[PDB]
Amino acid sequence: FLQWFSKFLGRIL
Secondary structure, three states: OOOOOOOOOOOOO
16 A cells, blocks of 8 residues: 555555
8 A cells, every 4th residue: 555666664565
């Protein structure tokens, strides 16, 4: 559920 790209800051899984 990232805005730009995959990142731990978001909800990437």
